[PDB]
Symmetry: C2
């Protein structure tokens, strides 16, 4: 009952961080799991996430006791796993009213409501008085799109083309 939330694919920098693709929704949610079960070719192994951040749409992660680029190379190809049970088992109504802001810092609007679609949920983004324009938009609730959600601040960071 191990599910895969990301994968270590290269190194980042020379002080031992690794480059990681994330499979979580929001994208940055991977950084909320301190205890990484790494698995490669049925070789299992444990790691602790000290800290990390996004660089575009990939992540850089600092693992405890991994302090140079050369040891870090050897982490390439490890799936980052966790027990099924450690997943939540958000509400739609918690996302309503969040300001939606694209990677260029443009305010696209506020989430008015969500739609069930038979695949990913869609967020209906309504323009407001400070919005970039007048257009309603419909964004998929996935990590390719939703990068970060801060409920306390009322903000969401997304990767989305405002022309689209």
């Amino acid at each position: 009952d191990l599910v895969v939330i990301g994968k270590i694919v290269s190194v980042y920098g020379i002080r031992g961080e690794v480059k990681v693709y994330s499979f979580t929704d929001p994208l940055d949610n991977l950084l909320d799991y301190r205890r990484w079960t790494l698995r490669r070719d049925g070789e299992i192994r444990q790691a602790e996430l000290v800290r990390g951040r996004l660089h575009g749409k990939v992540l850089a992660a600092k693992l405890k006791g991994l302090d140079d680029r050369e040891e870090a190379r050897t982490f390439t190809g490890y799936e980052i796993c966790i027990p099924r049970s450690e997943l939540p088992s958000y509400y739609w109504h918690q996302l309503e009213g969040l300001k939606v802001i694209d990677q260029g810092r443009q305010l696209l609007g506020v989430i008015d409501h969500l739609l069930e679609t038979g695949a990913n949920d869609v967020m209906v983004v309504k323009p407001c008085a400070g919005s970039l324009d007048d257009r309603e938009r419909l964004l998929p609730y996935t990590g390719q799109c939703v990068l970060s959600i801060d409920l306390a601040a009322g903000e969401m960071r997304v990767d989305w083309d405002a022309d689209f």
Copy 2:
């Protein structure tokens, strides 16, 4: 029990087609539903899809008896709905071995297997002898990514940045 599979957002051309965002996975799967239940501001209404196609990541759709741009404008803002029950209620093993080809026609590889992630499933794309390069890739199984799947042909069309 109506779910929303897409939305009519503008007109396309002058012969009465409409421009449609799709919420289906694969993106083009919307074109497989002939009978559209259109809903706007709790005003319900029925439409028949004659034919359509993708233009980039939006669709153009021809509806029966909608034959000029000016009537078509009045369709703007209709959600395209279907009964919950008309959704399938693919197998992972059916996607294995499909050739994965990006919007520029580059062969990224074949799907080796799929991963359960706690959010969208991920496709592990392995390079083969005709692949663009040597790199394994990990693509999200969503409509933002998967545009078209043809099992009989053994091909899948995706929107994905091969540099990523």
